[PDB]
Ligand binder design. Sequence first.
Ligand code: ATP
Ligand code: CFF
Ligand code: CA
Ligand code: ZN
Lengths: 144, 446, 193
Amino acid sequence: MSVLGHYNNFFFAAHLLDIAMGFKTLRTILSSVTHNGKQLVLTVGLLAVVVYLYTVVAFNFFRKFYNKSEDDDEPDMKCDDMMTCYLFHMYVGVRAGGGIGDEIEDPAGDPYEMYRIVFDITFFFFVIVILLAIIQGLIIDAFG
Amino acid sequence: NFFKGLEIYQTKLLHYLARNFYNLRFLALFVAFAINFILLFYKVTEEAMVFFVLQESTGYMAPALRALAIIHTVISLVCVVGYYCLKVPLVVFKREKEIARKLEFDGLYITEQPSEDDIKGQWDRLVINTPSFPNNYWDKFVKRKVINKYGDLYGAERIAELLGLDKNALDFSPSWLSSIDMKYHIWKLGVVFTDNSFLYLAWYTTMSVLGHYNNFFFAAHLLDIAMGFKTLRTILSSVTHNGKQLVLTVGLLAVVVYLYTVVAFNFFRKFYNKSEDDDEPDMKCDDMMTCYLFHMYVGVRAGGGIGDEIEDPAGDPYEMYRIVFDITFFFFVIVILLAIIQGLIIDAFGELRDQQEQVREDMETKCFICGIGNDYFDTTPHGFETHTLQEHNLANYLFFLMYLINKDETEHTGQESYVWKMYQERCWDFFPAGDCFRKQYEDQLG
Amino acid sequence: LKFFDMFLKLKDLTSSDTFKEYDPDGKGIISKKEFQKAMEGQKQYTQSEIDFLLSCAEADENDMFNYVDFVDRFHEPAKDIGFNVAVLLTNLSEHMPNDSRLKCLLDPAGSVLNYFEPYLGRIEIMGGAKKIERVYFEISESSRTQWEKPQVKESKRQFIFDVVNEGGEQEKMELFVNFCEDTIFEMQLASQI
Ligand SMILES: Nc1ncnc2c1ncn2[C@@H]1O[C@H](COP(=O)(O)OP(=O)(O)OP(=O)(O)O)[C@@H](O)[C@H]1O
Ligand SMILES: Cn1c(=O)c2c(ncn2C)n(C)c1=O
Ligand SMILES: [Ca+2]
Ligand SMILES: [Zn+2]
């Protein structure tokens, strides 16, 4: 990386990470990531599988609520494809504070209002509250 | 000899299926993953009407999906059959063993009667009268023991009627409809269908069959990964580990949100207009069910509570009441109850993992048989390993039991005869509890 | 002990890949000279043992004998009867641990006692005289083979976790005996399958 830094100076940024290899605390923090690596990989796989099941349900039934376009001329439907919907759920939904119900259309006054409510609340509980907390704990507990 | 020689081929097929149950399970998991990978390429096209089309250019994905669906159904069926030929016999064996023990040593259906609460005894009542009982349990003379033990006080004829034993056969001095014991097979089906693993396999196969009606049902098979890895099974078990406490806590959350709904419906109704257009106001708290749903759905998932999702109380006579309302909703619901609900699951996960690690540590620091810690045996090099591999090894006790069973009683030595008598009487005083050869002869042996 | 050791090494030596090289056809027949050369190449039999084994072998007019039948005739009875001698010597060694004559007698028997280590099972039981006693018995190879099966190991793991975590100190042995009965049935079923 030092030699590459002559090709482009910003490669020298990669040397800042040497501080994590020089202090015991930062080495412990780095080791805490891989301390529970197998469990962490399995948990992230379970999260991906659960979000895939939610994607399947939303692609079959709740497709009208995934229009992310303000202009009526050009609708940006996010769930007319399975890969687009899966990416939306994994990227926008998982990082959202309240789940996927925060990032899609309000179900009020619709025949699927109760199914949509159950969908959103279960996404919030299983994914946001349970699985993300477990993934975070697998690293914080390893550090401890 | 056709129609009679086919039995060998059928038995070979059944043994092959039973011998590769786990391999078939792994193969089914792989096939389900492939099917769902193919399903990720679906898309919906109007060219009103919506048609699901597999957006691919190679053109081989639809035939591959059909082939994989058929393969998956076949694999699931063979997995069910292989389970029926590998693990069901053990389940029936355990059930018959417990039934026979209850008959002989408790008078479950003669001296006493099963409780009305438990369904096991009620269902088991169907088998004792059968001729095939016990089919897997080794002891084929349990009925005669029961009759000889209870006829004097309860009448041999009545016992023979209860156990379905012929009187002439009882006093003996030493067409397909009738041939098949339909009662025993109904009992066996009831025993199998209440087995958790067989139920899971049946559900798996049912979803495989439904996947031909609609391909997306194959997605339900991905959850098999949670039943295949220990970590994911622990995560699933952590949900129901504290199930009663979890249900009570969610009930308390619902009750508290109901109280907040009542307060907001009586007093703070002007702040629940969720419509930007003045022409059509979307009031969310002019009804109690609408307001309750709003508070439970929008409010609980909101980061700051319900004050985030309703009108600002500034410059209003109820500004301070509204502030107290919002802050208390944030504290009691968002901060306290949600955190407790989450902890009831995360702590259960941690507790289950701790129990597993503690079992592993207990096995590595104590002897399963005598219970003496490894500190005593570690005074010598590899003392604990030698003790638990040569002196007290549970596999050796299992092999000793097999040795006693397969040896003639006339050939039993003094020690074998002693242990066999204690086993027949079911007295477990011959296991070394808290003692060993080393402690017994510590001076002489060295 | 020399008789037993000589006829217990025979199964190992005749089944060696070197012996298969010495009999490429694999018809179960070999000349006396080639059998002697194989025994010499193994380097486990002395000259007296080789001469004795050749004298035992019933050769043909062509100086050939079916070594498979030779081994079947001599190895099986030795494997059946030498276990008792092994158990006797093990019993004496363990109950006379500070004896010199016993060790000088056991030294010739090392190659016999080492053959029956897999087949010799030891347990300890609280005997009738209110003292712990050691019990020696025989273990069949099929028992180990079935004990190593995947389903049996699964059952053992489940039992160990259940009993240690929640079984309790009391009733642990009743549960263990029930597990033993269930596992004997499982091993019989696995042998059938
Ligand atoms: N009575 C005993 N018999 C056998 N092992 C014992 C006994 N008491 C303690 N142990 C210890 O149990 C450990 C063996 O674990 P266990 O019996 O669960 O099977 P395992 O060989 O570890 O498992 P697996 O073969 O499935 O990987 C060893 O450390 C042994 O020291
Ligand atoms: C005769 N016998 C068996 O045949 C048997 C058994 N446990 C399993 N089997 C098969 N026991 C305890 C037994 O005494
Ligand atoms: Ca006798
Ligand atoms: Zn012990």
